[PDB]
């Protein structure tokens, strides 16, 4: 976890996997709000909000 991981190839690899990791995090966020039935997000949503 040191200067080894810092380098142009590692930065480029970061850039390559940023879209995938970021929208994986989006997947996780959507799954979390769905599972928890988080109102503070779901109220702002369309048709879904009619559940409450």
């Amino acid at each position: 976890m040191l200067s080894r991981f810092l380098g142009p190839r590692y930065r480029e690899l970061a850039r390559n996997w940023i879209p995938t990791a970021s929208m994986w995090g989006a997947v996780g966020a959507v799954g979390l709000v769905w599972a928890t039935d988080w109102r503070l997000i779901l109220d702002w949503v369309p048709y879904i909000n009619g559940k409450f």
């Binding site: 929208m23 994986w24 997947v27 048709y47 879904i48 559940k51």
Partner: protein, 56 residues
């Protein structure tokens, strides 16, 4: 074909696959619950407490 565009758009990436599944479940739970409650109240009409609440 609509299926071909669908796959090329949001099915190739497994992470986009998961996003599609999750956002689909978001609306599937809503639609299925509304539809099943609708069928249930239609089958049992005038018997559930919701249908007879207004009397009292």
């Amino acid at each position: 074909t609509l299926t071909a565009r669908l796959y090329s758009l949001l099915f190739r990436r497994t992470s986009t696959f998961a996003l599609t599944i999750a956002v689909g479940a978001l609306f599937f739970e809503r639609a299925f619950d509304q539809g099943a409650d609708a069928i249930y109240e239609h089958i049992n009409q005038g018997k559930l407490w919701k249908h007879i609440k207004h009397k009292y």
